[PDB]
A paper describes a structure:
Addressing the structural implications of the stimulating register 2 conformation was enabled by the crystallization of IsPadCReg2 under dark conditions. Solving the crystal structure by molecular replacement (MR) using data to 2.85 Å was only possible after splitting the dark-state wild-type IsPadC structure into individual subdomains, due to substantial structural rearrangements of the overall IsPadCReg2 structure compared to the wild-type. Therefore, the IsPadCReg2 structure features an asymmetric dimer that is composed of one Pfr biliverdin environment (protomer A) and one Pr environment (protomer B). In addition to the helical tongue and the ZZEssa biliverdin configuration, also the side chains of residues Y168, H193 and F195 in the proximity of the rotated D-ring change their rotamer positions as described for other phytochrome Pfr states. Refolding of the tongue hairpin provides the structural flexibility for the PHY domain of chain A to reposition relative to chain B resulting in pronounced rearrangements at the PHY dimer interface. This repositioning of the PHY dimer correlates with the structural rearrangements of the coiled-coil to populate the register 2 conformation. Interestingly, the hinge-like rearrangement at the central helical spine of the phytochrome module breaks the Arg327-Asp494 salt bridge at the PHY interface. The quasi-translational reorientation of the coiled-coil register extends to the very end of the sensor-effector linker, which is directly linked to the strictly conserved DXLT motif of DGCs. Overall we observe a rotational movement of the DGC protomer linked to the repositioned coiled-coil linker helix. This leads to an opening of the DGC dimer at one side and a closing at the other side. In fact, the relative position of the two catalytic GGEEF sites at the center of the DGC dimer is affected by the asymmetric rearrangements in IsPadCReg2 and the net effect is a shortened distance between the GGEEF sites potentially facilitating the contact between the C3 ribose hydroxyl group of one GTP and the alpha phosphate group of the respective other GTP molecule.
In the IsPadC system, the bacteriophytochrome module is linked to a diguanylyl cyclase (DGC) effector and controls formation of the bacterial second messenger cyclic-dimeric-GMP by red light. In IsPadC, structural rearrangements at the dimer interface modulate the conformation of the coiled-coil sensor-effector linker and thereby regulate DGC activity. More precisely, the coiled-coil sequence of the linker region adopts two conformational registers leading to either DGC activation or inhibition. In bacterial phytochromes the bilin chromophore is covalently linked via a thioether linkage to a conserved cysteine residue located in the N-terminal extension (NTE), an α-helix preceding the N-terminal Period/ARNT/Single-minded (PAS) domain.
Numbering used by the authors:
A (entry chain B): 8 to 337, 340 to 360, 369 to 390, 395 to 408, 415 to 424, 435 to 682
B (entry chain A): 10 to 335, 337 to 410, 415 to 427, 432 to 443, 462 to 682
The structure:
Amino acid sequence: DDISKLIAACDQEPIHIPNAIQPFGAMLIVEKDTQQIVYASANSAEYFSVADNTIHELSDIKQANINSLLPEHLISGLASAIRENEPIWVETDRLSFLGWRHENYYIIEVERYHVQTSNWFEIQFQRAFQKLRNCKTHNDLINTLTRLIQEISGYDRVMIYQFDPEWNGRVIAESVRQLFTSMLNHHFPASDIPAQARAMYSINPIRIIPDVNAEPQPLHMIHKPQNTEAVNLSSGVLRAVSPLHMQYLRNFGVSASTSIGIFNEDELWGIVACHHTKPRAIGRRIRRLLVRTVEFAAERLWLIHSRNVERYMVTVQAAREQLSTTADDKSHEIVIEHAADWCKLFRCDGITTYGETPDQTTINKLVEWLEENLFWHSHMLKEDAPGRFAGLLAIPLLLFRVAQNEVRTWAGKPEKLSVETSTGTMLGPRKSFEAWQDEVSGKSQPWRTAQLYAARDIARDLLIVADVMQLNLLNDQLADANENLEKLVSFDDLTGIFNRRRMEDRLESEVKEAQRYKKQFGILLFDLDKFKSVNDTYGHNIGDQILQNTCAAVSETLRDTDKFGRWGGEEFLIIAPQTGMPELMQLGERVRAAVEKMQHKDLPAVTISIGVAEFQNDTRWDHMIDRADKAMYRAKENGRNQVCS
Amino acid sequence: ISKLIAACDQEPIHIPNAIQPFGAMLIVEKDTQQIVYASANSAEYFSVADNTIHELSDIKQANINSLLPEHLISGLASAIRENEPIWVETDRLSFLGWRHENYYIIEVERYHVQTSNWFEIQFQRAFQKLRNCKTHNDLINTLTRLIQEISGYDRVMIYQFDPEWNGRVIAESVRQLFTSMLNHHFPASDIPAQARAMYSINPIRIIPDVNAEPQPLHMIHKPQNTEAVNLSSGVLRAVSPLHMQYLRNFGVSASTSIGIFNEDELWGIVACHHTKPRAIGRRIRRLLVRTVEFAAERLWLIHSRNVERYMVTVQAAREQLSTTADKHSSHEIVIEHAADWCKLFRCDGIGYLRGEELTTYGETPDQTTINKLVEWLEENGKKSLFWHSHMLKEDAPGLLRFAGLLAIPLKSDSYLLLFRVAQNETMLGPRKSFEAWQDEVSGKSQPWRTAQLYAARDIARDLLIVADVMQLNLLNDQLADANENLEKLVSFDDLTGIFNRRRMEDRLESEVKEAQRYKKQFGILLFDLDKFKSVNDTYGHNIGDQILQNTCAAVSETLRDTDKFGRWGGEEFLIIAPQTGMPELMQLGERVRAAVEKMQHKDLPAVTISIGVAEFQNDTRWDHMIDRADKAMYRAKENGRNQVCS
Ligand SMILES: *C/C=C1/C(=C/c2[nH]c(/C=C3[NH+]=C(/C=C4/NC(=O)C(C=C)=C4C)C(C)=C\3CCC(=O)O)c(CCC(=O)O)c2C)NC(=O)[C@H]1C
Ligand SMILES: *C/C=C1/C(=C/c2[nH]c(/C=C3[NH+]=C(/C=C4\NC(=O)C(C=C)=C4C)C(C)=C\3CCC(=O)O)c(CCC(=O)O)c2C)NC(=O)[C@H]1C
Ligand SMILES: [Cl-]
Ligand SMILES: [Cl-]
């Protein structure tokens, strides 16, 4: 647009080489090699006449010698300087000199000066420093800075102007003695300080305009220089002001100004702006006191910001420990317990949902577009199909910010003014600074890096905890399946007692022990009597029901050492360790009587015939089963329901 | 001198009732406005305000308005806060006064106007140079050099206090007119609590001449309160003769020191020694203190940004652990990164124990000692908590070289340890002091600063988690692998590779239900080996079992694909034949019985089966069918073996 073109044209004016100065001093430019005064400001006579009573008009300077004009210390100091743009301050009783070396030149600015002897500045320094050290908060620091600067400088209005990333500004603190309207929280456009001017603070942190209506004095050529290109003046204070900005200050109701740049390392963070409603000069000592105060206040402010980051990281670690304590006691469960805390942690509105969120369907459309296209974070990109909501940080392996329309007050409505300057046609300054409002529909707060990494860390721990609940559940269920399939391999489905295999194993180990340690044990091998008659007359279901009954009757009779299992078909085995043949036969009698006398329960009466064997220094368990077996068979021959050895 | 060293810590240095002679002092009662004390040399300074003051006694005739400026009196009258000195100058005299309880204390010094920009230039240069420092080191060295350039003192040092109030000289700027003091430590006893506390009242202390004769306070008029007045808010307060002697033994004739405050905490001191007496005016004092104050705020900003970079480092390490896990073991990860963790935790060694495995890096005791430590922790009951010490020999007595230990307990289905090496490398003096400090840190490790501890619990948290995940994943792989084998054992038979008893009960039950839904027709064939006990006992188990395998091999080739064939009990088998009526069912039974008869003997006996057969006859339970097929099987067995019966 034509606006953009006009604002860009401001950069054409070379504000560092205006070949003129403000008239609150005088300036000489001297060629180092020839030691010849090559430039003098039109007002040089009225200052250097004090050094040289032969100086009457400007033209007399051409006839003068610099040793007649400069103090001894300034001359030696300029000769000694190898580094460029390092001003040297040297005073007489009536003049105050600031000189520096720039390429081939020495630039010397001189101001009239009165000697003034007191501890005022030292007391100011101690008090300002103590008051800034006492600030614990961004707010307290910036307001303390505004009051300190106003009291030191005496300016009618003092502001803290903070730059945003696009170089627009907001006034964040203010102190206004006389009747002025409050510019507090007013926004200013980037055009108001072009890049070329913001760049000045890096050469000299203070800029002084003691009189917006003072007539600039141009530099006149005295002797001819070997190079006629304009000399850079930006290191001093006397450099002339772009009439655009003189007019800007006029339109602002300001008659004199001073500003100091606020630097975070090499970055211009903002400025301290000082307006006065009548002309006002400030001496070199008040200037130094100002810049030192802003520099001490800035280090303090950055320290305050840095401590805020530490406090926030402590909160993040308290959150990650809280998450860890909850997961051990009880993953969406984890999300529900702490989300009110997390909303503070992440300065977000919505978080399975909590706080302000889209409905499940819109949330799934969100998810889906991310699946189509790490985390993702932005405030109202509008790069998708809208669902109210403007900020989203989504870690799929969701954090929501509602749009927050922000009314901004500007210091004047914009104007597309044109002005004809020397360097071309460019934007003229707005005529009104009256308050004027816009708002940003559809944007959210930007994501701070500290919040970003806290969020990536909370999501990382959550994913791990879901994985651990997972693996623990799968271990519980595979362990349960292994429990069932291991019971099925060892026991018999019907009767729920050791199958043949487990009885062979137990019997084998009882034999090995008894052979190793000379222990005594015996086995009981019994069978159900006339069982086929039960099966054919009553059926297998009734017969199997009898097998279950008989197992229940046998298991209640046995001692804790004995092991009881199903050997084959309707044959069962009992292993009685630490039992001699007498008590062994006794156990066979109690068992035999137990199966006879059990409850019939609408089923036939049942009898078992038991053979018995004793450990007789045997090698293998197979022999013992044979003895108990043929013994059982003699029990079958003498009439069933018997115990035989 | 020794008798004084016996009781130096108790000495009340704030109330010596004397001043150093680089000025004079008046003490005035606030209410009556009477001079009640004057320093013994008061005549020579106040003779300047009042040329009638000849001896000290003339002060008794004086009125405070005759000696003090109007600005000083009104400023004192308006002050409600105590101990905030007020600086007021005349053409010949320089006044500092403050209110303390009942009194106004006024210190006065002779004074000379400096008309020059020397101070503003010095200050700007100091600020620029400190602002250029990006590191702790650069800042402390720049500050020592600047303080020397401003104060003019032959030697300038920065003492940093440790948590126990010991001090270390960490920067120095010294003409070789003195010996180098860099890295010397002094014990906390060398600056008593009362002397460290004075910096909070006045940040600067000046001793222009160790050999100047102190001037006592004399009573001028009588005070309503007879107790000694506290003088600590000014600069003239007299110096403990013990410490004057300390500086004498050191070759120091004058000193200045400034406190370095982190908020209200005394972090260290800027000490300035000179080899001959040396005065410093009020403007140089203020310039010095302002410089230390700007430098201190800078240093705290540098430390705070270092904390930020350290937390970024910790987070980069915990992500690295997660990247490394993707190794087969937990001890594999520890071996790869423990040197980084030693940097991360500022410790000399680490040991990780997990079940039967032990890993060490750096300086550690041998494995056995590590087991004595573990056991002693789990014995004290202190195992479950975190535990840490910077003095093992006194905290954990009797475990003999190493001095620091941080032990993180880890619990699953079990430790991470950090080891730190001890610190090692009668006239008053810094040689006795440096060996006094050696005694205080004997067996004491560097204390565990808090930022490293939480780095350790957080690194350990991920270690326990990743070890647990490798564990649970391996154990789940093993439980899943075994269940396949135990599922082969539950559904199949050991010797025949054919369905178990269970699988035939289940198949039969489900076949009955299925036939019950669609009124479909199926039958079962129940066969047995004939005189098999006689075969087993005549030929043995090896031959007999191979016969069972032979018979299963022969039958499986007989079956149709729909039929299900399983081993029912002992030597009894079942065939479930879907889509088969009783005629075709009997046909299948004859083919099966004949199939088992003609098989290869292979030097083994001839074998025959007897088959019962049953058909689905509107049955409820699989029980009824087994009974029917069973009685049929028995009629075949009874009527001459090798038969099929319905
Ligand atoms: C038990 C009390 C003692 C004591 C008292 C005392 N000291 C000071 C001032 C000191 N003393 C310092 C001690 C040092 N330790 C060292 O290793 C070195 C060597 C470089 C020194 C100097 C010390 C550092 C200070 C302050 C700074 C300075 O160096 O000046 C005071 C305060 C004096 C006052 O002005 O009131 C007291 C009371 N001195 C001890 O040595 C022990 C015995
Ligand atoms: C096309 C060029 C434009 C232009 C030029 C311009 N502006 C400056 C200097 C300043 N502008 C400032 C702006 C503010 N002053 C305030 O008090 C506030 C309130 C918060 C703002 C936003 C400031 C502070 C300066 C510095 C000078 C000063 O301190 O007063 C210059 C450079 C001036 C110089 O030193 O030569 C130039 C060239 N401004 C535009 O509006 C357009 C027209
Ligand atoms: Cl200046
Ligand atoms: Cl002082």
